[PDB]
Every structure is written in structure tokens, then in C-alpha cells.
Ligand binder design. Structure first.
Ligand SMILES: NS(=O)(=O)c1ccc(C(=O)O)c(S(=O)(=O)NCCc2ccccc2)c1
Ligand SMILES: [Zn+2]
Length: 257
């Protein structure tokens, strides 16, 4: 099955998921000089005050912090979006070393990690229906660089020992994702896809310009996770990022000048 190794990694995914070579695949390199300021873009509206986190899951490719999305509690609106998108989960992509790990790049710069807050368009009723639509999901992408610790991340880091291997989960209530956001909500946006199989072309990407800083110790703990199941040969969960894909017939728009 698919993963991030030599034998089953991003260069192989097209054989099971032909849309991998599609017209609006993610991630992409963000050429900052070519992205055009769009004065018609709105400020993002990130309304996470009532967010209800439930659980954290090692799914064999990342860890997902899952939210109660049975009603409008944590929503993303505004920016490039029409309507209301409900937070369902967040996860990260990261490297084996600090010089790689992000999926999006900025003028070819790779960050140490990238956070994805996944939201679905509530006009489609459920997540499974939303992923079948071109405007089904909105993913808020936030770059991580290694420097000062991020205090709001440490509750996540400290639970990781309990979900070391694929299929392990743990209770993870009352986590506030507002503690993972940078100061500025300046962003780039473009139409794209899921960055893992099934690679569905259902995502409005909103990538924040300002990275968050996390400590070397924090990201080292991400790298102690396992792709494998309990008792299986240990494969460290590192380099779980898809590289940049062809931009093709797309424009990246900036919310700022
Ligand atoms: N990097 S990303 O934002 O594109 C992304 C990565 C992983 C997943 C995931 O499945 O957990 C997701 S997800 O929660 O949107 N799930 C997509 C896979 C899926 C499709 C249809 C039904 C269930 C899951 C998104
Ligand atoms: Zn992701």
C-alpha cells in the first residue's frame, strides 16, 4: 500500500491514483514574486473559540487531532471562500532533518514542518460528500521553523509517546488550536488537492505567510513516531511530505502587499 518510502512513495502514487498527474495537484512551490496581490480577497475569519477536540490518532502516515464536527463549533470563513467550512482535523508533515518537511515551499525554501487544519464545506452536509466537490474542503496551511518553542504545541508533543505506532489513538480533549496560529493571517491561496491519496481535487488552499516557531526538542519528538504498527519493524515516521507538483494552469493569489 502507499506510503513515503522508495518503493511506495509519492513517485508511485499515480499507479493507484491517476489523478496524481492531474491539473490541480498539491502541494506547489509558491513563487512570491509571481503571486499577485488580490485586493478583492477578504481577511480570513478563523473562529475557533468553541472548538471541541476529541482524540489523537496515529494513522500510519501522520497523526490526526480530531474534532467534533457535528455542528458549527470551529469554522473557517472569508478569505477566498464562499460559505462556511467546519474544522474536522489537523495534522502535520515533517522531515528527518530541519531542512525539509514542508509540502508547500516558498521560493523553493522547504520549512521543517507544515501544519494542515482541514475544514469541510457545510453546504455538502458531510465530509465524505464534500471531498467529491471542487470546493469541498479548505485547508489552512502553516509553516513550522525550528527556533523558540511553541507553548501551544507542547500538549500535542507530550501525548505522542502514547500513539507511537499505526492504529493507536488517545483521548485528546480540550485542546485549543488557536495556540498554533502565527500573529498574522496574511496568506496565499490557490485551487488544489489533497496531498495524500486519494489526491482528490477538492481543496481551496490557504497558506499563511508567517511561519510559527517550534523548538528542536518539539520536532524531535514528532520524529520518534512510527509508520509501522505495534511490534513490526520500526520505521520512523519522518519525511511524510509530498514534494511540489506542477502549477499548470493556476494562479496563486496573495492577500497582502
Ligand atoms: N494534507 S491534506 O490536508 O490534504 C490531508 C492529509 C490527510 C488526510 C487524512 O485522511 O487524514 C486529510 S483528510 O482528513 O481530508 N482526509 C482525506 C482522505 C479521505 C477521503 C475520503 C474519506 C475519508 C478520508 C487531508
Ligand atoms: Zn496534510
Amino acid at each position: 500500500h502507499w506510503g513515503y518510502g522508495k518503493h511506495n512513495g509519492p513517485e508511485h502514487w499515480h499507479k493507484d491514483f491517476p489523478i496524481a498527474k492531474g491539473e490541480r495537484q498539491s502541494p506547489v512551490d509558491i513563487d512570491t514574486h509571481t503571486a499577485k496581490y488580490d485586493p478583492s480577497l477578504k481577511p480570513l475569519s478563523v473562529s475557533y473559540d468553541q472548538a471541541t477536540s476529541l482524540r489523537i490518532l496515529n494513522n500510519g502516515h501522520a497523526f490526526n487531532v480530531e474534532f467534533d464536527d457535528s455542528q458549527d463549533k470551529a469554522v473557517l470563513k472569508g478569505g477566498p471562500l464562499d460559505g462556511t467550512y467546519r474544522l474536522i482535523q489537523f495534522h502535520f508533515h515533517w522531515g528527518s532533518l530541519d531542512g525539509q518537511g514542508s509540502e508547500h515551499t516558498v521560493d523553493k525554501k522547504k520549512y521543517a514542518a507544515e501544519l494542515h487544519l482541514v475544514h469541510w464545506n457545510t453546504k455538502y452536509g458531510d465530509f465524505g460528500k464534500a471531498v467529491q466537490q471542487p470546493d469541498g474542503l479548505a485547508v489552512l496551511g502553516i509553516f513550522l521553523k525550528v527556533g523558540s518553542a511553541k507553548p501551544g504545541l507542547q500538549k500535542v508533543v507530550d501525548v505522542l509517546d502514547s500513539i507511537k505506532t499505526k492504529g493507536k489513538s488517545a483521548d485528546f480533549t480540550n485542546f485549543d488550536p488557536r495556540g498554533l496560529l502565527p500573529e498574522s493571517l496574511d496568506y496565499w491561496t490557490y485551487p488544489g488537492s489533497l496531498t495524500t491519496p486519494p489526491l482528490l481535487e477538492c481543496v481551496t488552499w490557504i497558506v499563511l505567510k508567517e511561519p510559527i516557531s517550534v523548538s528542536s526538542e518539539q520536532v524531535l519528538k514528532f520524529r520518534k513516531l512510527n509508520f509501522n504498527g505495534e511490534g513490526e519493524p520500526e520505521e520512523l515516521m519522518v519525511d511524510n511530505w509530498r514534494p511540489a507538483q506542477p502549477l499548470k494552469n493556476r494562479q496563486i493569489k496573495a492577500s497582502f502587499k
